[PDB]
Design a protein around this ligand. Structure first.
Ligand code: HEM
Ligand code: EV1
Length: 392
């Protein structure tokens, strides 16, 4: 009768079935972790937005009291740049990157994103009448965009796409570490190069702050480049793959987007909301935080089940249904407040161009395998498809 967290989805595009009873307990419920530790489970949309702006919640997975949802994550110590930091140190870091992630900067990259998407679909269409869309499209689009974002030179695009793929797919754990060391090593060299080279992108922008205000040291700069890739790659890739699967499993919603390409921006917001692939943001209370007449005591864990929060029926009528006309505004698929996704302006435009161009170019797109033989991620990680066999 106590509900374990995290759990696997049964259906790639719905929250795990066991959480259903807890949806009625707003704004706070509770779940049990692998070791019997109980944590708060924020089911209320308004409560979730208020808590995610609260400086008394911490992302510091270095603390002995930080809830590690799995036994496997028990090995989490170094603090990860931006997300693994509290303010003021977190804001100091974010302030240096924010100017690279304006909506104007997002908008300026449309033609570069269009060219990446067009090149990958041209290659996929030329290669044959079927594809594994995760490897052929969903995985390389976001890593190639992050190339353009960071200012990786064209000649290095292949190496970068490959090493970023090993990072996610790494046949062996040794491939994941070699890829990581290879990219950190590579970012090191590219910073020296960009000292004695021109360059547009986040890396040149941070070489500029460095000179102009001593600001990012070279090790910090490498950490920023690494987290940007890691935060930007699988999230975007999994939205492309699971959005596609989901669209193919809802023929009448897919037909409305084919009919009216103008709906695609609204559709991307509704898919972010409905899919909520960044499921289960984790905090610990540093101090007592009240919510109504309930108190989250110092040292107690707080889990934000993105997928349920984005299906709060006091905000979204018929929340478990895909609807292109119902405002998906104020969704928390990119989080909210202190740690709200830095790359969300860019992510939205990648999704709009990737899905918009796929639909335009491949009107016959359909699953090339039965939908229940297609593997998807377990409950303890970013949700999404591991493969997506398609034909057209
Ligand atoms: C569909 C794509 C994406 C989704 C669904 C997504 C989701 C999220 C979420 C939910 C958070 C908040 C995590 C928490 O509060 O615990 C986050 C943070 C972040 N995301 Fe994204 N994200 C996406 C794309 C990207 C991209 C493209 C970048 C590119 C650089 C990026 C960089 C970041 C960074 C740096 C943070 C930490 C911000 C901070 O600590 O202040 N993300 N993302
Ligand atoms: C800056 O640090 C990061 C930022 C984002 C990510 C990717 C990510 N973003 C938001 C929510 C996430 C939520 C996740 O699990 C529920 C997850 O599993 C690997 C990755 C997530 C990884 C990061 O690396 C530690």
């Amino acid at each position: 009768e106590a509900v374990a967290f995290p759990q696997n989805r049964s259906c790639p595009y719905h929250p795990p079935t066991a959480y259903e009873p807890l949806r009625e307990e707003r704004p706070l419920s509770r779940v049990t972790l692998w070791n019997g530790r109980q944590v708060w489970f924020v089911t209320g949309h308004q409560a979730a937005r208020a808590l995610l702006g609260d400086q008394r919640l911490s992302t510091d997975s270095t603390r002995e009291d930080f809830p590690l949802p799995t036994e496997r994550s028990e090995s989490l110590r170094r603090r990860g740049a931006l997300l693994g930091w509290d303010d003021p140190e977190h804001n100091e870091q974010r302030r240096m990157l924010i100017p690279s992630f304006t909506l104007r900067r997002a908008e300026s990259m449309r033609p570069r994103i269009q060219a990446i998407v067009d090149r990958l679909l041209d290659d996929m269409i030329a290669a044959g009448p079927s594809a594994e869309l995760v490897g052929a499209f969903a995985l390389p689009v976001p890593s190639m965009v992050i190339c353009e974002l960071l200012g990786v030179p064209y000649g290095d695009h292949e190496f970068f796409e490959e090493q970023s793929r090993r990072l996610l797919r790494g046949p062996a754990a040794e491939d994941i570490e070699k890829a990581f060391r290879s990219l950190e090593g590579y970012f090191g060299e590219l910073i020296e190069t960009k000292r004695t080279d021109p360059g547009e992108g986040v890396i040149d922008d941070l070489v500029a702050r460095q000179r102009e205000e001593g600001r990012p040291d070279d090790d910090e700069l490498v950490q920023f480049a690494t987290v940007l890739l890691v935060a930007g790659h699988e999230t975007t890739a999994n939205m492309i793959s699971l959005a596609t699967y989901t669209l193919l499993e809802h023929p009448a919603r897919l037909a409305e987007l084919r009919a009216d390409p103008g709906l695609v921006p609204a559709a991307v917001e509704e898919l972010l909301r409905f899919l909520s692939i960044a499921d289960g943001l984790v905090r610990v209370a540093r101090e007592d935080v009240p919510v109504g007449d309930q108190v989250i005591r110092a040292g107690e864990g707080v889990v934000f089940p993105t997928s349920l929060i984005n299906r709060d029926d006091s905000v979204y009528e018929h929340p478990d249904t895909l609807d292109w006309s119902r405002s998906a505004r104020h969704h928390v698929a990119f989080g909210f407040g202190i740690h709200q996704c830095l790359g969300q302006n860019l992510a939205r435009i990648e999704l709009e161009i990737a899905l918009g161009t796929l639909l335009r170019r491949l009107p016959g797109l359909r699953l090339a395998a039965p939908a229940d033989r297609i593997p998807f991620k377990p409950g303890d990680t970013i949700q999404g498809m591991l493969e997506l066999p398609v034909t057209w």
